[PDB]
Design a protein around this ligand. Structure first.
Ligand SMILES: [Zn+2]
Length: 258
């Protein structure tokens, strides 16, 4: 015990250990599509994942992370609102107990069934731990998931989840291609924000794609069989591991598209 997503340790309690939870640039936020303004100076997003090297998948007790080798510029995000080069370190998801909830960002108050976060750190700061101390340290690519057709490129992830059911379990997860999780369009919204889990550091340029990917009910059902607890502990399904929308405060959300 420790922050989490339960009644006694969930998002409304995080500010006691992490006072930045009530900060000026917290995430996620609701994206009001009518208020977001098209910014013609935003540059196309460059997602360069052809040399991505996945290594491992880990249940960390709040989500599962697919981890990459970030010891060289293999998988990088550049362009869009970003200055410089950001290296992929891990992706993970947030999801609900029901299809009507699960995403962290919302779009005109709509909640999606889940949200994928591809986390990248700015190579100008040398390593992730230094990057999170900087206002432009991370770039997180957020992708909404809706339930409908299966996402073929997700299936290798869902099929390994039985081997990392409980907190602290990991499994080898090499040769996974994250290009198979992207939608067709790279149109996006962007704003300055934070990590959505403690320590809630205000170090993220968010890039949230407009186009959701579709996953099947069977795929998200397997997410919901994971556990927040460790092996041999009372079972607590890993569901509703999302932080709700936070006040936008003095921020503007920009759109890459008209
Ligand atoms: Zn996340």
């Amino acid at each position: 015990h420790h922050w989490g997503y339960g009644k006694h340790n969930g998002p409304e309690h995080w500010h006691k250990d992490f006072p930045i939870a009530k900060g000026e640039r917290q995430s996620p936020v609701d994206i009001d599509t009518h208020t977001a303004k098209y910014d013609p100076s935003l540059k196309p997003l460059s997602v360069s994942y052809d040399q991505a090297t996945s290594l491992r998948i880990l249940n960390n007790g709040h989500a599962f992370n697919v981890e990459f080798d970030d010891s060289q510029d293999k998988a990088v995000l550049k362009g869009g609102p970003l200055d410089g080069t950001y290296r992929l370190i891990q992706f993970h998801f947030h999801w609900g107990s029901l299809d009507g909830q699960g995403s962290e960002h919302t779009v005109d108050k709509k909640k999606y069934a889940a949200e994928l976060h591809l986390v990248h750190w700015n190579t100008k700061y040398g390593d992730f731990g230094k990057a999170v101390q900087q206002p432009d340290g991370l770039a997180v690519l957020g992708i909404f998931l809706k339930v409908g057709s299966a996402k073929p490129g997700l299936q290798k992830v869902v099929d390994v989840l039985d081997s990392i059911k409980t907190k602290g379990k990991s499994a080898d997860f090499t040769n996974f291609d994250p290009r198979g999780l992207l939608p067709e369009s790279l149109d996006y919204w962007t704003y300055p924000g934070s990590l959505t889990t403690p320590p809630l550091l205000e170090c993220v340029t968010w890039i949230v794609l407009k186009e959701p990917i579709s996953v099947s009910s069977e795929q998200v059902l397997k997410f919901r069989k994971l556990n927040f607890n460790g092996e041999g502990e009372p079972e607590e399904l890993m569901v509703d591991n999302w932080r709700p929308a936070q006040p936008l405060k003095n921020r503007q959300i920009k759109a890459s598209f008209k």
